[PDB]
Amino acid sequence: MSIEKIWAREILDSRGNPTVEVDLYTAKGLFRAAVPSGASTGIYEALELRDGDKQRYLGKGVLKAVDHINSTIAPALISSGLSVVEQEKLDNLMLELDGTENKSKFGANAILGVSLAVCKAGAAERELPLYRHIAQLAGNSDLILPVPAFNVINGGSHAGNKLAMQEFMILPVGAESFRDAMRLGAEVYHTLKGVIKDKYGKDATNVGDEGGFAPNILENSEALELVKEAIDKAGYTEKIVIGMDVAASEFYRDGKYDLDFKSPTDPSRYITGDQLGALYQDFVRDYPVVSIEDPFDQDDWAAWSKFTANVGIQIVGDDLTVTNPKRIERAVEEKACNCLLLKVNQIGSVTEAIQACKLAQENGWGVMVSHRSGETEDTFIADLVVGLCTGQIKTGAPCRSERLAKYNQLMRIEEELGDEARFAGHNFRNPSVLHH
Amino acid sequence: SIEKIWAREILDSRGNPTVEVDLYTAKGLFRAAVPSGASTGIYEALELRDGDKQRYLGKGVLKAVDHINSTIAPALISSGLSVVEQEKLDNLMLELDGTENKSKFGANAILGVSLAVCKAGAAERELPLYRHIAQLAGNSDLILPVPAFNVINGGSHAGNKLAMQEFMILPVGAESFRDAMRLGAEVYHTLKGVIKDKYGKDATNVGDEGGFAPNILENSEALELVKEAIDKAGYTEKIVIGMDVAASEFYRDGKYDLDFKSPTDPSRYITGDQLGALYQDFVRDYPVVSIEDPFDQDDWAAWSKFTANVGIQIVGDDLTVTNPKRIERAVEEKACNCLLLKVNQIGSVTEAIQACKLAQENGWGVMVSHRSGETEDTFIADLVVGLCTGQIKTGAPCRSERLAKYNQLMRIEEELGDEARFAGHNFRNPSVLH
Ligand SMILES: [Mg+2]
Numbered sequence: 001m002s003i004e005k006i007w008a009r010e011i012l013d014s015r016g017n018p019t020v021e022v023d024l025y026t027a028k029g030l031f032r033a034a035v036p037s038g039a040s041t042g043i044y045e046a047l048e049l050r051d052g053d054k055q056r057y058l059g060k061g062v063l064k065a066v067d068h069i070n071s072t073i074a075p076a077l078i079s080s081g082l083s084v085v086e087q088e089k090l091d092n093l094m095l096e097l098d099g100t101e102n103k104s105k106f107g108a109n110a111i112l113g114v115s116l117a118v119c120k121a122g123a124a125e126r127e128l129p130l131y132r133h134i135a136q137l138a139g140n141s142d143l144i145l146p147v148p149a150f151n152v153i154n155g156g157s158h159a160g161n162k163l164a165m166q167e168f169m170i171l172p173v174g175a176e177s178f179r180d181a182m183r184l185g186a187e188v189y190h191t192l193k194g195v196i197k198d199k200y201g202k203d204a205t206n207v208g209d210e211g212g213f214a215p216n217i218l219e220n221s222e223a224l225e226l227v228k229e230a231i232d233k234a235g236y237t238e239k240i241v242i243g244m245d246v247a248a249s250e251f252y253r254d255g256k257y258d259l260d261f262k263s264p265t266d267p268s269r270y271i272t273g274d275q276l277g278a279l280y281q282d283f284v285r286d287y288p289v290v291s292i293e294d295p296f297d298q299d300d301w302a303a304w305s306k307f308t309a310n311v312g313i314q315i316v317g318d319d320l321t322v323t324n325p326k327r328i329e330r331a332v333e334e335k336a337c338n339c340l341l342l343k344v345n346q347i348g349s350v351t352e353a354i355q356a357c358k359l360a361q362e363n364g365w366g367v368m369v370s371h372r373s374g375e376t377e378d379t380f381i382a383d384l385v386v387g388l389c390t391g392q393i394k395t396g397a398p399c400r401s402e403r404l405a406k407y408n409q410l411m412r413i414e415e416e417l418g419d420e421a422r423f424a425g426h427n428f429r430n431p432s433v434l435h436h
Numbered sequence: 437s438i439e440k441i442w443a444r445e446i447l448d449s450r451g452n453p454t455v456e457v458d459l460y461t462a463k464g465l466f467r468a469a470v471p472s473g474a475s476t477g478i479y480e481a482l483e484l485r486d487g488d489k490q491r492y493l494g495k496g497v498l499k500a501v502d503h504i505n506s507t508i509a510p511a512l513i514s515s516g517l518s519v520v521e522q523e524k525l526d527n528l529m530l531e532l533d534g535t536e537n538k539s540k541f542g543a544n545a546i547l548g549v550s551l552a553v554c555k556a557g558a559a560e561r562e563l564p565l566y567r568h569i570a571q572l573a574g575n576s577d578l579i580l581p582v583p584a585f586n587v588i589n590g591g592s593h594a595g596n597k598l599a600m601q602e603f604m605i606l607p608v609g610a611e612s613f614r615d616a617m618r619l620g621a622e623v624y625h626t627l628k629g630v631i632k633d634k635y636g637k638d639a640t641n642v643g644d645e646g647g648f649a650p651n652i653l654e655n656s657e658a659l660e661l662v663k664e665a666i667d668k669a670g671y672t673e674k675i676v677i678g679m680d681v682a683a684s685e686f687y688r689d690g691k692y693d694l695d696f697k698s699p700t701d702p703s704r705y706i707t708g709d710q711l712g713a714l715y716q717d718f719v720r721d722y723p724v725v726s727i728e729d730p731f732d733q734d735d736w737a738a739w740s741k742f743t744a745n746v747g748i749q750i751v752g753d754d755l756t757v758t759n760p761k762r763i764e765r766a767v768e769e770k771a772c773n774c775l776l777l778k779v780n781q782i783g784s785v786t787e788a789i790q791a792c793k794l795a796q797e798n799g800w801g802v803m804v805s806h807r808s809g810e811t812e813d814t815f816i817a818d819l820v821v822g823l824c825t826g827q828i829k830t831g832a833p834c835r836s837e838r839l840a841k842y843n844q845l846m847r848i849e850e851e852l853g854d855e856a857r858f859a860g861h862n863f864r865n866p867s868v869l870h
C-alpha cells in the first residue's frame with residue numbers, strides 16, 4: 001500500500017571504506033540514502049555494525065548490516081502497511097525490532113539508512129521538498145540557511161605536526177547570503193592554500209579527510225595567525241571569524257592536558273583544565289574565535305561548566321554529548337556547554353535526531369549539524385540543517401565532493417526558497433530572532 | 437518536449453565554480469554538472485570563465501550560465517525536438533555557437549545541456565542511462581570496465597622530485613567490478629600504511645585525485661612502492677600498473693628533463709631515444725601494462741617509434757585532447773593505440789560518442805577519464821558502460837567525486853545481473869567478449 005520495495009547494498013565512502021546504501025521504492029519512485037561513518041568507535045555512540053572479517057576490507061565490510069535490511073527490516077516495514085509519511089512510527093518499529101538501547105543487533109548504520117530513505121520517500125508522498133518535510137516533522141515553520149563552518153587547518157591526531165588542537169575552521173558570518181558565504185569560504189581557502197605553498201612548500205598543500213591542510217605548524221597560536229592572515233589577505237577581515245575543534249579528550253592525561261602530546265611524553269608540561277581555560281580566553285581576546293568545540297575532556301564535567309559560565313562564546317559539545325539524549329540532559333543540567341553537535345548516525349534514526357535537536361534548542365542551545373570524517377555523495381544533512389533551522393553546519397572544507405555535495409545542495413535550497421530564504425549570519429547561534 | 441532548462445553555478449571538487457544544468461520534462465527533473473576544463477587550449481574545446489577578480493578570483497562561470505539561461509534554453513525549447521533526439525539537439529547547440537572549439541557559449545555551457553538532455557532522453561525511452569547511451573552508439577553489449585586507480589603522484593602537481601605524474605593500479609584479475617573495487621581499496625589502504633611507516637603521517641595526505649605524493653626522487657622508487665603494496669595486499673597475480681608520464685611537462689629544447697623540479701642545467705637532459713629506453717626497462721622490471729603521454733604532445737616521431745617497439749598500451753592524452761582531427765593524425769602515424777576520452781574536452785555527448793567510435797574503428801582502446809576538478813555527477817560511469825570501452829580512470833578510491841563514479845558502476849553491475857561482464861584481462865579490447 002505504501003512501500004513497494006526496500007533494497008540495501010554496500011558502497012564505498014570517501015575514505016574508500018564500505019558503508020550502507022538503501023534504496024526504497026514507492027509509487028513515486030526510487031529514494032536513495034547512504035550512511036556516513038566516523039574514524040573510530042565511541043562508547044556512547046549507537047553501534048556501527050561491521051563485518052569484522054579481517055580478510056575483506058580489513059574487517060570493515062557491512063554485509064551483515066545490509067543483510068539485516070534485506071532479510072528482516074524490509075519485510076517488517078512493508079508488511080506493517082504504514083505510510084512513508086509516518087516517520088516516527090516506522091522509526092519506532094525498527095527500534096522495537098532491534099530491541100536494544102544502542103541498536104547493537106542491526107547496527108545504527110542499518111537502521112539509519114532505512115530511516116533516511118523513508119524520510120526522503122515521505123517528503124515525496126507529502127509533495128514537499130525534503131527540508132520542508134523535516135521542518136514539519138520537527139515543528140518548525142520558518143526555514144534558515146546556515147552559516148557554514150569550513151575546516152581549513154588540521155592538527156591533533158589528524159596530522160603529523162606538533163599542533164595539538166584538531167581543527168581550525170572559518171565561518172563567513174558577514175556574508176550576504178548562503179551563496180555569498182560559499183564564495184567567501186572558497187576565496188579564503190584558495191588564498192590560504194597560496195600562503196601555505198609559499199611558507200611551507202608545495203608538499204604542505206595536500207589535504208586531509210575533510211579537505212583541509214595540515215602544514216608543519218608547531219604552535220596553536222601560529223595556526224590562528226595563519227588563518228587570520230589568509231582572511232585578511234582575501235579582504236574579509238570583519239566578515240569571516242574562526243571556529244576551533246580542540247578534541248581535548250585526545251590529549252587528556254591523568255586529569256591534566258598535554259598540549260604537546262605528539263612529542264616524547266613529559267608529564268611536567270601537562271596543564272590543568274583551568275590553565276587550558278585561560279589559554280582559550282587569550283585566543284578569544286587576540287583572535288576572532290567565536291566557537292570552540294570540545295575544549296575539555298569528555299568526562300571533565302567540572303571544567304566545562306566553569307568555562308561555559310565564564311565566557312560568552314559558543315561552546316560546542318561533540319565527544320561530551322555524542323548526539324545522545326541522556327548525555328545531553330546531563331550537559332543541560334550541569335550547564336556544561338551551550339551548543340550541540342548533531343551527528344545523525346551517532347543516534348541512528350531521523351526521529352531521534354530531531355528529538356536530540358529539540359532537546360538542545362528548547363534549553364537555549366545552539367545546534368550545529370555535522371558531517372562525519374567518512375562521508376558519501378549523500379546530501380541529506382543539508383536538507384536537515386535547513387529543516388531544523390539551526391543556523392550552522394560544519395561539513396568540510398570547500399574541497400572534496402563529499403563535502404561540496406552538501407554545500408552545493410544548500411545553494412540549491414537557497415535558490416528554491418527565493419525571497420523567503422533567510423541566511424543566519426551573525427545569528428548562527430540563535431537564528432530564531434531573524435524571521436519576520 | 438523540454439519544459440524548462442535552468443543552469444546554476446556550483447562548486448567542483450577543488451572548490452572552483454562550474455556549471456550545473458536542470459532539465460524538466462513531463463517525466464521529471466534531470467540534473468547534470470560539468471567537470472573542470474581548459475579555457476586556453478589550442479585544440480581543446482574551451483571552457484568559458486568570467487575573469488572577474490572580485491568573484492572566486494576570476495574563476496566564475498556566470499557568463500556560461502547566462503548563455504544557457506538566455507540563449508540555448510529558449511532555442512532548444514523552441515526547436516520542439518524530443519529529448520531522445522540526442523544528435524539533433526547537440527547539432528543545434530553546435531550551430532548556435534558556430535565555433536569549432538565552442539568559445540562563444542563555452543564548452544562547459546554546451547556540455548551541461550548535452551548531458552542533461554541525454555538523461556532526459558533515457559527516461560523518455562524508459563531505459564537506464566547506459567542502455568540509452570548504448571543505443572545512441574550502436575552497441576548491443578554492455579561491459580563493466582577495469583578501473584584504473586591513481587595511487588602515487590609526481591610531476592608538475594606534486595612537491596616531490598618525481599618527474600612522472602601519476603602511477604595507477606588496474607585490478608585486471610578481479611572476479612567482477614565489485615571485486616575490482618575491493619582489490620583497489622585494499623591495495624590503496626595497504627599503500628597508505630606503507631607510506632605512513634616509510635615516510636610519516638603527513639605523507640598520507642591526498643592530492644586532487646585522492647592519490648599520495650610522498651617525497652621520493654626516482655621513478656623506480658615509486659614503482660617499487662606500488663609493487664610492495666600490491667604484494668603485501670596479496671594480489672601480485674591480479675593487479676597491474678598503469679602510468680601517466682605527462683612528458684610535455686618536462687620537454688625542454690627538444691630534449692627531456694627528468695629532474696625538471698630541481699634547479700636547471702641542460703647537461704642532465706636526455707633524448708627521446710633514451711627516455712624510450714627507460715620505459716622499456718620499466719616495462720621489463722615492473723608489471724607496467726599501459727603508459728599515457730610518454731613523449732611531448734608534438735614529438736610525433738618519438739611516439740611512432742616507441743609504439744612500434746612495445747606491446748603495451750600507449751595512451752594519448754595531451755597528444756589527442758579528444759579532438760577528431762588530432763586523432764586522425766595519430767591513427768595515420770601510428771602514434772598510439774588508446775584514446776583518453778575526456779568528454780568536456782570535446783563538448784557534447786554526440787561528439788564524444790563519435791570520437792570513441794572513431795578510435796574503436798581503428799583498433800584503438802578507449803579509456804574514459806575524469807578531470808582534476810570533478811563533481812558529484814556520475815555520467816561517465818554510465819558512459820563507459822554504454823560505449824563498452826573496458827577501462828575508466830576516475831581517481832583513487834578516495835574522495836567522493838571519485839567514488840561516486842565507482843559506486844555507480846557497482847550499481848550498474850548489480851542491475852545487469854547475469855548479463856554483467858567484467859572486461860578483466862581484455863580491458864584493451866573488450867569486444868572479443870561481445
Ligand atoms: Mg569534533
Ligand SMILES: [Mg+2]
Nearest residue numbers: 680682728753
Ligand atoms: Mg593525463
